[PDB]
């Protein structure tokens, strides 16, 4: 399952490039690249990535923005592509392959608010997603969410699985080896991590006693659903897919399909460490536990 | 796992019979029959079916209709039965077995609008469903859906799994061999297909640029949930189980339990081919991708 | 996988102790104990339990109640703990371990109405949950549910899985051996059962023709989601997690994440026996079918 032209390849991460070019237009440039990521202690996965992160870098745009997206494929041998779930596009024209050492540019609107998956769309898509080519784009609602004024703090969390390396039989027929959370930064000083079994246990997300926390979440799969729960609290408000209309209240646990997103909000009332899990506990045991450390200052 | 009395049996498909007998009463006659279906290229499954289709033929009635249902069991040796999720009925009186070469008639009301599973209810129900005895009945709401006037086109899609042939161990403990979509005709000229890995890729559903499409969907299982997504669009409106009250907006992906239904609506803004998937990509890779071809005319 | 200090241990069930100590304060005392439970005919599981039941005893409190909870750990060698999904608490202070032959007391508010999972929170949590340390706490809404006046009868049902005994490899990587329902009593004379493949088939829940039934349900997992369906009816009303705001209508089947709850309501229109399933039929075949017997009197 090792591709000869990937042997010894470890392309250093490259920052996302984004810039606004109009009141409703934004440029985004990513790479597709092959990068070693430590997904569990002592376990390197030579991931297929956007920008050397898996999941990829966070993208945030405003509702109504047109994205002018460029992919620079640095993979020496495999084509790659980009599918944003946020956008209205022709898949056979706008989510098409970019060949090795080439670039492609595609343009399409994000008119729907929410927390969307993005991923490589190159056949076999399972292979590209499972090897690491997944991520989130957030589209901020033009009128906000009704509970905005209540939120004290926010983070992004993404859930994904890892399988046996580049093994299509395992991808289709096996249980995941690892299931993991990562967090992607929304503001300076936020963590920005990859999908691994340990970082958000050792370096918890931080908050202060009494705060209302918002998490933008997506379960990118490839294969499993997620039963998303924060220990020691109840979600005050949940917006399915991050659309303000899809409001629930007082949920213990939010069911996310594969590619499913949500905005969830909850209050942390006491100092301590609060695990964040998928409540499918086989997955939690295989890595899918993050921690939120709540202190009298926030740090 | 081969039943001696089924060896060499391939009963030709029989059309559904339906006729209205009152303003709120409809007759439906199906068969239970044993029919070879090509579920993947070169792979025949000697399915247990209603009417020689798997999933079975589409049934459409109006909210408030009483169904007077007859099953004619053409299986030479196995009893079969019918459970409509649409109806209020006594399962132990109204969903009972019909013996080989016999008929049975049952009557019961459909008072709830939506997109319901039907299936054989004979013990072991897993065996009967897994072998192909599943389908959809749509109950049209008396006052429609709020977004009716926006819809330009509509189709029905059903998701199911196929396992090792008639293998109860695999049915209970194995991963699916194939996961598939089929489409069932609502109007003359619509496709009517069986659950296979290829037909709706080779013969895509058709639409025209700019249209709002409605899909009536159900995941009949037997065993898996579905993460239903149309590539290149976002669902404008979703009605869970097809009940007009259970409205969501702006969903990327709709989580369907086993037997779960929905009405989903989305706009196709550009010409091209739009895949339709379950986003549990192991299932997509095992067959569960249909295509929608969007042209400047619709065809 | 057998713990030497558990060999031959079968601690007799102990009743839940609860008493109200103020208008908004309640005392609850449970045990953690090791008890043999027949989970399928001829199959004993030496379960890790609260109070000698698996799932554990039902707890019911009012919205706004503070719970003063004591756990008495009767396990000779393993620590145990309690996590109520109903409560706001510091997990690292309030859901901490109680050592063998010790007690611990923790206090925390239940301010959210609904149908919540509880479970042991001792690492590895998968092991403690899978071995039987799960249950439900219901928090009654201060203003009720809008459909209260329509309900004629109510029961509690819980779904769980059982795996190979105390086998962490199976817990993380295997399919469940059994998937089961149990019912926990809300009023005198209601059944109170453990998660097994047979009791609620042999001793069905009882109701009368024409009644509206409410079920408080939770799928405690540990690992699977549930596609909850009552044969022969449609849910008139569903409140996700039991929060009155999360209202759906006319659902055939309710998708429950692991730890997910609901209040569901449906009408039984005809005499007979009505199966209650998860519609993931591999799980149903492995035990997850209960029965509701509907008679002209109710019994
Ligand atoms: Cu403007
Ligand atoms: Cu530009
Ligand atoms: Cu790729
Ligand atoms: Cu996708
Ligand atoms: Cu899994
Ligand atoms: Cu605050
Ligand atoms: Cu009339
Ligand atoms: Cu008639
Ligand atoms: Cu049958
Ligand atoms: Cu059913
Ligand atoms: Cu599967
Ligand atoms: Cu139109
Ligand atoms: Cu008071
Ligand atoms: Cu007290
Ligand atoms: Cu424990
Ligand atoms: Cu929990
Ligand atoms: Cu299972
Ligand atoms: Cu009544
Ligand atoms: Na908007
Ligand atoms: Na109606
Ligand atoms: Na309240």
From TrEMBL, chains A, B, C:
EC number(s) on file: 1.7.2.1
List of residues binding Cu(2+) 2: 24
List of residues binding Cu cation: 80, 85, 119-120, 128, 133, 279
Domain of life, per lineage: Bacteria
GO molecular function, one term: nitrite reductase (NO-forming) activity
Positions bound to Cu(2+) 14: 154
Catalytic function, reaction form: nitric oxide + Fe(III)-[cytochrome c] + H2O = Fe(II)-[cytochrome c] + nitrite + 2 H(+)
Protein residues bound to Cu(2+) 9: 83, 85, 119, 279
Residue sites binding Cu(2+) 6 per the record: 40
Residues that coordinate or bind Cu(2+) 15: 167
Residues that, per the record, bind Cu(2+) 16: 211
Residues annotated as binding Cu(2+) 13: 152
Residues annotated for Cu(2+) 1 binding in this entry: 6
Annotated binding of Cu(2+) 7, by residue: 63
Residues binding Cu(2+) 12: 88, 233-234
Residues annotated to bind Cu(2+) 8: 80, 120, 128, 133
Binding site for Cu(2+) 11: 85, 119
Listed cofactors: Cu(2+); Cu(+)
Every Plastocyanin-like domain range: 34-143, 181-295
Residues engaged in binding Cu(2+) 4: 27, 68
Subunit structure of this chain's protein: Homotrimer.
Stated name of the protein: Copper-containing nitrite reductase
Source species of the chain: Geobacillus thermodenitrificans (strain NG80-2)
Organism ancestry: Bacteria, Bacillati, Bacillota, Bacilli, Bacillales
Residues included from the entire protein: 45 to 343 of 352
């Amino acid at each position: 399952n090792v591709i000869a032209a990937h042997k010894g390849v470890n392309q250093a991460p490259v920052p996302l490039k984004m810039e606004r070019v109009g009141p409703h237009d934004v440029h985004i440039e990513m790479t597709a690249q092959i990068t070693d990521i430590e997904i569990d202690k002592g376990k390197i996965y030579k991931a297929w990535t956007f920008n050397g992160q898996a999941p990829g870098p966070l993208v945030v745009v405003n509702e109504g923005d047109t994205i002018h997206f460029t992919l620079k494929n640095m993979d020496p041998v495999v084509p790659h592509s980009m599918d944003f779930h946020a956008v209205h596009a022709s898949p056979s024209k706008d989510f098409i392959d970019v060949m090795p050492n080439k670039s492609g540019t595609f343009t399409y609107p994000a008119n729907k608010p929410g927390v969307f998956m993005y991923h490589c769309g190159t056949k076999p898509v399972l292979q590209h997603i499972a090897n690491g080519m997944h991520g989130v784009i957030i589209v901020k609602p033009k009128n906000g969410y009704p509970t905005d004024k209540e939120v004290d703090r926010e983070y992004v969390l993404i859930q994904n699985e890892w399988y046996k390396y580049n093994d299509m039989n395992d991808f289709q027929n096996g249980v995941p080896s690892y299931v993991v959370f990562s967090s992607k930064a929304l503001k300076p000083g936020d963590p920005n991590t990859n999908g691994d079994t340990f970082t958000l246990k050792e370096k918890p997300l931080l908050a202060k006693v009494g705060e209302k926390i918002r998490l933008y979440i997506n379960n990118v799969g490839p294969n499993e659903v997620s039963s998303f729960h924060v220990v020691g609290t109840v979600f005050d408000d949940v917006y399915l897919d991050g659309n303000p209309n899809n409001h629930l209240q007082g949920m213990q646990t939010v069911m996310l399909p594969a590619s499913g997103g949500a905005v969830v909000e909850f209050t942390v009332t006491r100092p301590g460490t609060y695990p964040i899990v998928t409540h499918q506990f086989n997955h939690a045991q295989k890595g899918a536990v993050a921690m939120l450390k709540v202190t009298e200052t926030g740090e």
